[PDB]
């Protein structure tokens, strides 16, 4: 979000006796399925958990997360079960459904950029 440049390394000094600021922490997991044809293992699902204020010098927060999101897709050949979206809205879950792997990757990258974890 903010950028600056120093002409020479001389222009930089240090103070050490100030408390560190809180950080953003993301913990994510993913699912893979082996490509039947040849030599690939595709990504079919992801789930991440985010905390926007993680104290480095204090006790761990409880709960360790505030927000989360999830994504799912179909590899190349299978199709989602009939009325998948109906079931999704029926059970009130924050699951974003994607068509191909490329859309899933784009969504993941957009979320990573927007949240901007450390």
């Amino acid at each position: 979000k903010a950028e600056a440049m120093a002409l020479k390394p001389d222009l930089v000094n240090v103070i050490k006796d100030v408390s560190p600021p809180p950080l953003v922490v993301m913990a994510f997991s993913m699912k893979t399925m082996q490509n039947a044809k040849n030599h690939q293992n595709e990504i079919i699902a992801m789930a991440a958990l985010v905390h926007h204020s993680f104290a480095l010098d204090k006790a761990a927060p409880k709960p360790p997360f505030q927000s989360h999101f999830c994504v799912v897709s179909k590899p190349k050949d299978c199709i989602f079960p009939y009325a998948f979206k109906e079931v999704i809205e029926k059970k009130n879950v924050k699951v974003e459904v994607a068509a191909t792997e490329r859309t899933l990757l784009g969504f993941f990258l957009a979320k990573v950029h927007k949240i901007d974890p450390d």
Partner: protein, 64 residues
């Protein structure tokens, strides 16, 4: 380390135990290799004759 080798996708090969070989293949999980290319071996250079060796005459050798 030891890994299993899968030869389903290998067209031409000739293998015996103890052969030092160089393979090219896919190993995605790290517990099994699907071989796709087998590099051929290369022999040692022949003996280089001297000037004396070309002056020898015809000889007969028997082997039993």
């Amino acid at each position: 380390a030891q890994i299993p080798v899968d030869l389903s996708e290998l067209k031409e090969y000739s293998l015996f135990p103890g052969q030092v070989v160089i393979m090219e293949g896919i190993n995605t999980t790290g517990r099994k290799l699907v071989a796709t290319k087998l590099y051929e071996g290369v022999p040692l250079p022949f003996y280089q004759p001297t000037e004396e060796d070309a002056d020898f005459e015809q000889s007969m050798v028997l082997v039993a």
